[PDB]
């Protein structure tokens, strides 16, 4: 595997998935470099926390539909880290609305962090990935199955894959590899809610995902032992439907 | 057979290529069909005098549809002249062959605005207008599946179109509103290098999307809801 | 040009007595289509068919034939050569399933579903080569159930994604010669209370299928319409999970 | 994070060269208790006996014509006699042959379908028992199922026809605690290095590194990278899925 002493970026991880990613690769000896879009108490504890680890880690605010805001947030990446070897894109919004009544703004903000979000994080990452680097992005299974009242989210994520195998194809020679991780459904603030089992019966291993599960896999694509795997899409999500 | 006859069509991107095909194709078979262009040329003028030389009650308007309000204002229009409409077609989009690490963030906006927030919103403006029934149909590529460089920014948006059909092909499916995608291979050292791949030995033409297209308008795919239909030769 | 053309071609549909087959033999025929099809046994199934068959004037013709033997599957051949000498369709459509837990699953019942699913498509394939020349449209009945898994069916359903492995290698093989091949991915179709709607609620339309809406499918692969559409799976599933 | 591979169990259908081969060695070499099979005692079946000798713990390699139901019964008497139990199967027996379609005969259709297809169901069928409660399925895929060969639409069935089966086995036994999952391999370099040399320096090998995003072949070492992962409580939540191991090909 051979994680220690790597630098990664991983984008939106105050909570859920990127925050369980950022901790697991942290606690393995990764140089982890994350962000979230507002100061909040998950963003503290996360910052708390960080520090508490042995490592050279980073938790800044950047709001990723803020083009501006990339920009400034990878010239203190390359200001404190000068290279990165894993890149993440996991920072992504939802929303359920019924598609009619779907505003135009609130499509825009979906693409603009799911979709356009992760291209700009990619793009102004390669100069700082150099000659070998892994850049992988959060899918969703939900894409190729389709849910009511979230086709602007499916959208987003089904894109990913179409640039991932592209952007693959391109960089290929020159060292860098880029995959999906398609998830299943992953507990994450489910607890700050009161009474699962519609999505357990859809799963194969009946039981929802954990966001170090997510990192388990996120741990192998960052790794050598995944050298000859690119543009694919790893599917993460249990066999779920 | 298909029964086409005196149902209704928008077809984006009539002016030239897949979509003047499929324009042509549906206006010969009886098919009211209302098109869109963005810039006036020859090619939309030769366009909009074959289609008022034939018995059909055929329009072609200019509308850029990476402006959201020139897309309002095209189903103001397809509203008062047309009432209704049966089947949708996806196909206007654009592409360019950029270095990634050099594409500027306008150029992807722009394949972004027209190839999926365009498409995203044409159908969100056809929707009252299919009413009980309808078949939208959005023209993807086999190329996001295979990848292409100098092109990740293309890929991208014909892959999200996939993504937005099966959802919606699930939210309305219930309401009588069928959404399909169809997947495009190519459409003479450059006719070989795509033949080569072909596993028919040949590239497409316009009118063999308009085979498919007329399926999918048809009741005989009235079974057939959020599919990505191959229409590529086997390529790849 | 935006028609069919269907009326004087010459179709070769298996099991055509019951479900799924039957009624594309019949719509075929309805059609102009000289429908060649074939069963295991004599029921009145196949009785009925012959009759109905007749009082739709044309040149049908059904046999007995069990596709889990190669020496009447050459046979069957051997009449469609005598009786039509050209064909322009080829359905692969008989298929056999069952229930068993997997781990009871004798050898016998794992080779008969193989035999009939696989080994009996691909002679059926083998054979009508010949007989379909310059032109030809090969159609196989394939699932999308294949994609999602079932218990209790594994055996089904690597039959019936095998069916497009051969198909795809078959287009690209064929192509050139004017030979078509593809698969019709169906969903859960009505043949011979809670099943209904165990799986319409798993349906995009809110229905099950009709063997006539796979029969609208086939008449497409079938006109010159899809002539440039080969290798594919194309889905006839109502959107399914 | 740490694949926890030392002290586990498994058995690797057709070791004794190529790609197998080079999942013996490896799994072998980080701890894991190797059962391997092949087909016919060869040099190359005798080296990797004295080879996993000069390794330890028990490995097995044993031969076992999966073609014949009966030996496949006999492979398992032995797994279960010498070990007793396994953590991880891994169905990489194969066969390919290029045969034009119109001529392949009923007999070698038949072989390819008893070794790719039933004869992995019959390994998989045999270990369920000896996988108890926690274990993990592998079976060897191939990319060039979902592209279409000419001259092996044979071969491209059955290796498309495991993922139908290992889609299902997923479904069915996840809540036992068993996983089943396929890798689609590209193409990795084996014994081809003998079938030299300009036949092979670089009409083989450019011409399918050209399809590729990395430019170049595989090995059977990157194909244990991902055995290995998928072996490991890393993957604990991956069942039912097909990954792809072919630097992008296409
Ligand atoms: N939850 C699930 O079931 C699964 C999740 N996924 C995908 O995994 C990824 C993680 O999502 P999930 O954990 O579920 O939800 P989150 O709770 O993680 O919410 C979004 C995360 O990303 C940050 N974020 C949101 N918007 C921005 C923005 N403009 N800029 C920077 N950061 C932002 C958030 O930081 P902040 O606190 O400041 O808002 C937060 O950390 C998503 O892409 C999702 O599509 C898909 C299938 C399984
Ligand atoms: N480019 C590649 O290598 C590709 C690999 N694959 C798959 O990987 C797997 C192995 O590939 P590869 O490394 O080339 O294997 P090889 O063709 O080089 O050798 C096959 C191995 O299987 C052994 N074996 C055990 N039982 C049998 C049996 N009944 N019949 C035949 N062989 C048996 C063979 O033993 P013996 O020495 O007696 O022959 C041999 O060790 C295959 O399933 C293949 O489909 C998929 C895509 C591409």
Redesign the pocket.
């Known amino acids: 595997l051979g994680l220690r002493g790597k630098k990664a970026l991983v984008?939106?991880?105050?909570?859920?998935?990127?925050?369980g990613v950022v901790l697991a690769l942290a606690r393995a000896g990764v140089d982890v470099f994350t962000?979230?879009?507002?100061?909040?108490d998950?963003?503290a504890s996360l910052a708390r926390e960080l520090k508490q680890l042995g490592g050279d880690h980073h938790a800044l605010?950047?709001?990723?539909?803020?083009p501006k805001?990339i920009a400034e947030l990878f010239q203190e990446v390359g200001r404190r880290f000068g290279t990165l070897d894993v890149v993440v894109?996991?920072?992504?919004?939802?929303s359920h609305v019924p598609y009619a009544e779907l505003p135009v703004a609130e499509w825009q903000r979906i693409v603009?962090?799911?979709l356009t979000?992760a291209h700009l994080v990619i793009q102004h990452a390669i100069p700082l990935l150099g000659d070998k680097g892994s850049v992988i992005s959060?899918?969703?299974?939900?894409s190729e199955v389709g849910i009511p009242l979230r086709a602007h989210?499916t959208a987003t994520?089904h894109a990913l894959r179409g640039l991932t195998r592209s952007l693959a194809k391109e960089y290929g020679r020159s060292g860098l590899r880029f995959n999906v991780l398609?998830?299943?459904?992953?507990?994450?603030?489910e607890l700050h809610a009161l009474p699962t089992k519609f999505y357990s019966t859809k799963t194969a291993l009946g039981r929802?995902?954990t966001?170090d599960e997510?990192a388990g896999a996120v741990a192998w694509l960052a790794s050598d032992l995944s050298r000859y795997v690119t543009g694919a899409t790893i599917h993460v999500?249990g066999g779920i439907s």
């Open positions: 984008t939106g991880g105050s909570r859920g998935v990127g925050r962000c979230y879009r507002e100061e909040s998950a963003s605010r950047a709001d990723l539909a803020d805001q894109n996991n920072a992504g919004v939802i603009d962090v799911n979000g959060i899918g969703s299974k939900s989210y994520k398609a998830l299943g459904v992953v507990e994450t603030e929802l995902g966001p997510v999500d």
